Amino acid sequence: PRSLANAPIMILNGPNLNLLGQRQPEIYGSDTLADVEALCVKAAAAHGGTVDFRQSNHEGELVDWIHEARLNHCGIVINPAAYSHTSVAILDALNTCDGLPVVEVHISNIHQREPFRHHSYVSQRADGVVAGCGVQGYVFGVERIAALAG
Amino acid sequence: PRSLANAPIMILNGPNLNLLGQRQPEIYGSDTLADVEALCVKAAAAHGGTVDFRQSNHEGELVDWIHEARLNHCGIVINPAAYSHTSVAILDALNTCDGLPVVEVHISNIHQREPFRHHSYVSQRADGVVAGCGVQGYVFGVERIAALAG
Amino acid sequence: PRSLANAPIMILNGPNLNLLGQRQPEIYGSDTLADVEALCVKAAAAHGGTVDFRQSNHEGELVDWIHEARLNHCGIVINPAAYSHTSVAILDALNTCDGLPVVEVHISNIHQREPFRHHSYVSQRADGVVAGCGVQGYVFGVERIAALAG
Amino acid sequence: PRSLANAPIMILNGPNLNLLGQRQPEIYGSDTLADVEALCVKAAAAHGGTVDFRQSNHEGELVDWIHEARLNHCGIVINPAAYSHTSVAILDALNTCDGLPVVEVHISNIHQREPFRHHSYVSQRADGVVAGCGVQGYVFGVERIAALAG
Amino acid sequence: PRSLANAPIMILNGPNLNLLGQRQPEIYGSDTLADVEALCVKAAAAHGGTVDFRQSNHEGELVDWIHEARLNHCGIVINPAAYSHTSVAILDALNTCDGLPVVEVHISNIHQREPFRHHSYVSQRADGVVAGCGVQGYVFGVERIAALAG
Amino acid sequence: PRSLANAPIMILNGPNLNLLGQRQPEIYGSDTLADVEALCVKAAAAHGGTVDFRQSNHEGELVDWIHEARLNHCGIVINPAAYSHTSVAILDALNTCDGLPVVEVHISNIHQREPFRHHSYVSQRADGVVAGCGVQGYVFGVERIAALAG
Amino acid sequence: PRSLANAPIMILNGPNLNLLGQRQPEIYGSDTLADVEALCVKAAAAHGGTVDFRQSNHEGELVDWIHEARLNHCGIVINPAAYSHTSVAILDALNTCDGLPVVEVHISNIHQREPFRHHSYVSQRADGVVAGCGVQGYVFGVERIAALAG
Amino acid sequence: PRSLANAPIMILNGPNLNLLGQRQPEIYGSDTLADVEALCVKAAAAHGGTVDFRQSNHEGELVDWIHEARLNHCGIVINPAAYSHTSVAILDALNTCDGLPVVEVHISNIHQREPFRHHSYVSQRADGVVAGCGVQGYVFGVERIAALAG
Amino acid sequence: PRSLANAPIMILNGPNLNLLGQRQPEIYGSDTLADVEALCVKAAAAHGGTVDFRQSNHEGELVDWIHEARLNHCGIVINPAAYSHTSVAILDALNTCDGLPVVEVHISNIHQREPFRHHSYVSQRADGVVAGCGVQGYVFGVERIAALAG
Amino acid sequence: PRSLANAPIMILNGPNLNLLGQRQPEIYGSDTLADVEALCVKAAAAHGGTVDFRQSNHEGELVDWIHEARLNHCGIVINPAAYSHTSVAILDALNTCDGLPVVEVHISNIHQREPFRHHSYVSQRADGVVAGCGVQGYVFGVERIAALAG
Amino acid sequence: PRSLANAPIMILNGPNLNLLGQRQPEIYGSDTLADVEALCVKAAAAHGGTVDFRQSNHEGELVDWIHEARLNHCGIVINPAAYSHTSVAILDALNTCDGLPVVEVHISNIHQREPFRHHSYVSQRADGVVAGCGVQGYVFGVERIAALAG
Amino acid sequence: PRSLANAPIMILNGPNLNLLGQRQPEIYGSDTLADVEALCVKAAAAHGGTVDFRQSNHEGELVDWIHEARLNHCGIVINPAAYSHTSVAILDALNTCDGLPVVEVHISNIHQREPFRHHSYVSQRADGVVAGCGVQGYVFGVERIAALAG
Numbered sequence A, B, C, D, E, F, G, H, I, J, K, L: 001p002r003s004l005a006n007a008p009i010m011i012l013n014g015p016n017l018n019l020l021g022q023r024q025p026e027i028y029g030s031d032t033l034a035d036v037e038a039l040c041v042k043a044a045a046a047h048g049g050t051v052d053f054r055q056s057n058h059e060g061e062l063v064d065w066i067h068e069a070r071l072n073h074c075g076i077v078i079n080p081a082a083y084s085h086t087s088v089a090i091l092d093a094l095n096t097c098d099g100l101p102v103v104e105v106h107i108s109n110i111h112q113r114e115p116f117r118h119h120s121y122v123s124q125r126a127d128g129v130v131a132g133c134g135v136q137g138y139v140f141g142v143e144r145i146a147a148l149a150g
């Protein structure tokens, strides 16, 4: 139990999000990942906190980073992307974050897409889930962490 | 296409929400519906808008109100509650609101509850879905409408 | 057992159909509910009968009206709309209309839409089911009632 | 926690039951709803209590009545009829009645009927469930509430 | 795009319909296939058209006839009978009739029979579907073609 | 067709019920099987009848006893316990008791437990089913038999 | 209702059976279709009857031959082969044979093979079904027809 | 590998068959179990063999008897009745009878009854399965064993 | 076991393919069946073989042709079209072609179309399956047969 | 809570295991049940305990023995065999053994066999489950009981 | 949109394919991955192109390579091996390769193997799918890319 | 085929197990991974062997390590953790270890947890599976490998 003041918010991004804003804009929009990071920096600063913003295409690396967050961060905002639908491993890693606030974010409204995107393993552990609010959902995520970590 | 300045945001609440803050606090919290309304009034005022906040236990009345919103409001934030899981009628009413922003909100994280709560008919039409962020999710809802209606 | 001459045909319309001809024309067409009523009045008059045309967004009100029909009308043409897919209540009300001819009508061809529209509880009781014949299906409905009530 | 002496037993009846004893007697029998009420009044009086017997075809009205029962009655005997199979809303309304005894009754043996009648949302919350004991089941219901409220 | 005046309506009947009116009258009635043809000839004549009425027990022959209709007829009224539930081939044949009006007709109400009759491949392509209106459904079918071909 | 006066009510209890009142009291209560027998003896005597109360852990023995009931008893109150969910054999045995009233009883509310307990083969044949009314359900069972055997 | 003496037993064989005894002997054996016919002729003669033995690879032709049997034969022994699992059309043709005895035969034990062979449409109408008794099952078939036609 | 001459055929009957010919004649007929035994004794004698005919309502006893047959009989004709649908234990016992001919018999045509009767564990092991040929199916059973044991 | 030199490659085409290149070009392309035949003739000639190219809309006729191939051809390239999804009969016919190479071809990528097109009975027997390579897939088919027959 | 020193370990074996080592060796091996007992006696003696080894083919008898264990033994190693997959009765008996260590053993690796063997009712209650370790699994079972009873 | 002349074809191989030709030859054959590369190099050279042939056991590394291909290669031939069945992440990476030809290849015929191998996430995006043509499938893959990239 | 004396036992641990003994002790216990390693070292030494103990959060790395085991180790004891439920890749890597003994271990009893943990891909290949025996299951594993490798 670190506060926004003692430790950053870890913002994790799963596979293919490195290409945000360069494909399927109608689905993901035209902002890049760097735009999202900046949005997150600003949203956190307004509460007196900071962020640690990461993206990986590797499941295992996401898991390693969650383990790091348990010791060094005050909450996790995660867009696990494709692994949302397939990774029991990320679910179990988050389950080890006892007491740590987790908010799941999806840019697109997964409930309107293919049936296999309707389910998310992460949602079983996440305190909150935001879907289809575009990149603004990331801000919502930071804000909810601020309120819970508070 | 009314703006936050020309027309209020309709905030609809479904069945049993009149008892918010008086039962199952661990699930729904201890804020009342009146507390929620005030949060929404405040969030909207910051963007220069107003709200029209209603609650009903009757599916058909929620439908009538959605029809009204099509003509007189700039967006809908809706917590359909139990009707989320059963009402094709509310989905079809929302489907007539062509171009109108709709955000679905749930206080609890439905994905951690009984399987029949996992599915929502509204999610197929909603631009955004926020679940398990407590009453704070209503604020996110207002905020997303402001940005969309903008 | 009233005849077309002793009692009107009750035409019941379920939710959202009050907006017929103002949205999703490619699906529902551009005729209004008033245009449909007129079609029904004409079709019935050719057989010497009349109609009692109603629309509601409330499941329970549709049930009440079915009860009324049992005593005072010669048959029912019903477009239960969304409730087609959810209402066991309307099915059971129609099951009390022993001997009364019922025809179910759907403007759109439900079998080509979302899977949850594929099933109708009313179809289990209805004598006939007409789908995807546009508003002309209402005429077919009145005609079948005329032949059965005859 | 009101006793049979401080408050009546609310007996709720759902849709189409107003026609009890006038159709499908082989299924529902030939007693009317008024006959049932009388049975209930008698059963309760033997234990020193009273009843408040209601029937509605409207889901939302049943919900309102359940809310009223939480504040003013000592238990609920409910035959939700068709809404047994479809209403998550009634379930959640009953879930707010913390500590209040609920007994679910069905005149017919739903397990021998159509598959969609096999499931009941209410059963998940009801303390007891009686099916296929005819209208005598209502008496069993009053009796169990007397023993639990005791 | 032929009109009712330039080309007949093809009426296709699938397997076992050659025995119409000689078995299971309670299901299919006591009119024969020849009686149906006469009804269709009359309904079409009222609009200034003609019909080409055929029956076969062979899937492939139905398919051949559908091919013929694309070049020579103004619409198809089809009762595919058993092949309704099993023939992807007839579906695909109809899918080649781009722009040609197709109405699917069932004498019995399939939705009240065995579960395997509840689904029809043809319903995915057909403009309209009529079920359980007895042989009168064929007249409806001719009438809808007349209005679409018009 | 023996009456309560010519023949006893057979009360059958399935496996593990010999341990009633010694484990999982919160589920099954703290009354023992002997306590239940006494309740039954009393309920029956009030109507002028007697009971033959048995318990077995063997499926085939329960079947044997059902066959004996066909010839010598006036009705059966059965709590098949675990065999409720697995024994087609008991169902068929009961299906041979033509005209004999059968009431199924469960102490716990099976609908609230593991999904495999949600279904009962016996319910298909039983006239009435009582669940979740504790050992009082046995009295309800005796009483219904009295009214039916009457 | 023709007797074994007035009319032959029609023995129908579905697709690929023309190759019996030339492939997959371990499954279908090494007797040919001609061997089977001879077994059938002998089995029927012992009861004073005759057979009309046919094979086709065409569904519709099997349907035409069933129609013929209704007028001219005393019963049907049918091995529909692959069509067993797919042909609603053969089912409906047999359903028109009111009062005619039908026995379904399979050489192999279909219940031990692929799951799609586990189901047969014909079994819903057939009076008797024999599977896995090799070609001897045809004799069983003839015999049962003799006994029923008797 | 005993022959019909060295060892009897064991004919096993499952639960409730002791009441054959005294209930549901339309389903099971009016012959008794003794009548069936006599049929079997006769069929077997014609091939020079004998039978050992048993009935039990206990699964475990059927199992024990199957073990005995492995050492002392030349084949098994079995009608497992309700245990057909539930007993993996009988299947596994039959799976220990390496090389021994087993024929499964059902008097009724299970494929026309309740869905839970459609499946039989025994069918996976049985060489042949005869269903719906009435008690005559037992004779077919004896006859197949004679040909296989030969 | 005939070689490309002793016997032709049979190329079979199922229903509706006679219309290739005249409808749904975006799905099937604009080449005609005659174009495909020419591609096949060329591909085979390069390896020293010939082809026998056929199309039918009749399931049973495809079956007959497969039988012929077993005796007279060196392999089969087959596009069963709609029958891919429904014909157990074609599968079983192919199963009699022991040792004969079979390659299944689909012009469109069935895995991207309607769910009922995702499954093919032929795929269980075919040595190779080619889907969504347009008409070029037929050449891949000829080439694989050449390499296997070699 | 008896210790290995105060009470034996009950080793229960379900149906058909009396034939261990005489059939399907590749599956169950060639050791007999007597060989397993000796392995269990030895494993237990090393910890200072004893065993009470039993086998039955009767579900109810297994249940009775479980009841006996609750009072007189220190843990249960059970191989329910076929009943693993069907017996809710054995599960509930084990559920009465509050605090008593249970280990489930399977000789074969059920997860590689037929789908119906994949599931076990006992596994829900068992502390530990061992599958596919041959007879050695029984030793692992004794060992775990020793460590838990310790 | 690079041509075969401007950019190589990327050939990706998923997990365990580094062991090709050293295990399960009957399934995968005896050619090695180096043998496959050589076939690919030759097939491409005939069209004037080159290949970039890679193998990895890491999902994320496949994803990275697909990203690279979007910028630097003219098409992708991919055998995702096990990830075919589990990786939404590879699917989404391919989905970013707008306009890039993709062909999926499987050496074995997956439709004849375990059910979990029947489905592939890649098949939803791949232009073409080749299965069960052995390593020759890779050649087909290069050839199709050549024709599409052309 | 290396013996315990020629080569170590590879013990593989999947994701999140690095945190063993620091979270969810009631599920996984309070021993650490280092404690487990020491148990394994000891169990193996008693049979004259050694162990090579590894843990990774990366699927691909586990696969690489399995490849290494094929050439250098005498067996594999694996706890794939979350990848148990999702990784077809690990299954296939194990499938390449022809003849190598594999034991699957799970500390918790997965059959009592969430439904998605009930299935394991590794169980299809593993010689033995041990679940819910705590960290003692690793010792069982080493022992079974010793006996098989022997």
Ligand SMILES: O=C(O)[C@]1(O)C=C(F)[C@@H](O)[C@H](O)C1
Residues within 6 Å of the ligand: A015, A016, A017, A079, A080, A081, A082, A083, A084, A105, A106, A107, A108, A109, A110, A117, K092
């Ligand atoms: O941000 C999203 O909308 C998502 O998490 C991202 C992806 F890339 C997809 O794999 C998910 O389905 C949705």
Ligand SMILES: O=C(O)[C@]1(O)C=C(F)[C@@H](O)[C@H](O)C1
Residues within 6 Å of the ligand: B015, B016, B017, B079, B080, B081, B082, B083, B084, B105, B106, B107, B108, B109, B110, B117, D092
């Ligand atoms: O806000 C919620 O958590 C919810 O919408 C409200 C209800 F009342 C429930 O019926 C929903 O399942 C959740």
Ligand SMILES: O=C(O)[C@]1(O)C=C(F)[C@@H](O)[C@H](O)C1
Residues within 6 Å of the ligand: B092, C015, C016, C017, C079, C080, C081, C082, C083, C084, C105, C106, C107, C108, C109, C110, C117
């Ligand atoms: O007429 C119709 O097409 C329909 O009944 C009307 C509605 F509004 C929908 O809810 C139904 O799905 C279809």
Ligand SMILES: O=C(O)[C@]1(O)C=C(F)[C@@H](O)[C@H](O)C1
Residues within 6 Å of the ligand: C092, D015, D016, D017, D079, D080, D081, D082, D083, D084, D105, D106, D107, D108, D109, D110, D117
């Ligand atoms: O009392 C009953 O049997 C029931 O609750 C009443 C109805 F009206 C039906 O809708 C229910 O399925 C059963």
Ligand SMILES: O=C(O)[C@]1(O)C=C(F)[C@@H](O)[C@H](O)C1
Residues within 6 Å of the ligand: E015, E016, E017, E079, E080, E081, E082, E083, E084, E105, E106, E107, E108, E109, E110, E117, G092
């Ligand atoms: O006209 C009909 O009702 C039907 O199309 C005809 C048949 F012959 C049956 O096969 C169909 O299921 C219904």
Ligand SMILES: O=C(O)[C@]1(O)C=C(F)[C@@H](O)[C@H](O)C1
Residues within 6 Å of the ligand: F015, F016, F017, F079, F080, F081, F082, F083, F084, F105, F106, F107, F108, F109, F110, F117, J092
């Ligand atoms: O009385 C009961 O609640 C029950 O019939 C008894 C048992 F023992 C369980 O096996 C049933 O599931 C419920």
Ligand SMILES: O=C(O)[C@]1(O)C=C(F)[C@@H](O)[C@H](O)C1
Residues within 6 Å of the ligand: G015, G016, G017, G079, G080, G081, G082, G083, G084, G105, G106, G107, G108, G109, G110, G117, I092
């Ligand atoms: O006779 C048989 O065993 C069968 O009817 C014949 C065939 F050819 C198969 O298609 C059936 O599945 C079984």
Ligand SMILES: O=C(O)[C@]1(O)C=C(F)[C@@H](O)[C@H](O)C1
Residues within 6 Å of the ligand: F092, H015, H016, H017, H079, H080, H081, H082, H083, H084, H105, H106, H107, H108, H109, H110, H117
């Ligand atoms: O012979 C029979 O039809 C049967 O095997 C006998 C019984 F008693 C039933 O339980 C089986 O379903 C059918």
Ligand SMILES: O=C(O)[C@]1(O)C=C(F)[C@@H](O)[C@H](O)C1
Residues within 6 Å of the ligand: E092, I015, I016, I017, I079, I080, I081, I082, I083, I084, I105, I106, I107, I108, I109, I110, I117
């Ligand atoms: O070539 C094809 O894509 C196909 O086999 C042909 C048809 F006509 C369709 O029926 C198949 O589903 C696909």
Ligand SMILES: O=C(O)[C@]1(O)C=C(F)[C@@H](O)[C@H](O)C1
Residues within 6 Å of the ligand: H092, J015, J016, J017, J079, J080, J081, J082, J083, J084, J105, J106, J107, J108, J109, J110, J117
């Ligand atoms: O020990 C076994 O492998 C088993 O428990 C024994 C039997 F006999 C089978 O019924 C089980 O499926 C497996």
Ligand SMILES: O=C(O)[C@]1(O)C=C(F)[C@@H](O)[C@H](O)C1
Residues within 6 Å of the ligand: K015, K016, K017, K079, K080, K081, K082, K083, K084, K105, K106, K107, K108, K109, K110, K117, L092
């Ligand atoms: O080439 C194949 O057949 C496959 O892609 C390769 C593997 F390694 C398997 O995992 C796939 O299921 C099939």
Ligand SMILES: O=C(O)[C@]1(O)C=C(F)[C@@H](O)[C@H](O)C1
Residues within 6 Å of the ligand: A092, L015, L016, L017, L079, L080, L081, L082, L083, L084, L105, L106, L107, L108, L109, L110, L117
């Ligand atoms: O050791 C176990 O119990 C487990 O394999 C370990 C994990 F980490 C989970 O992911 C598995 O479901 C269980």
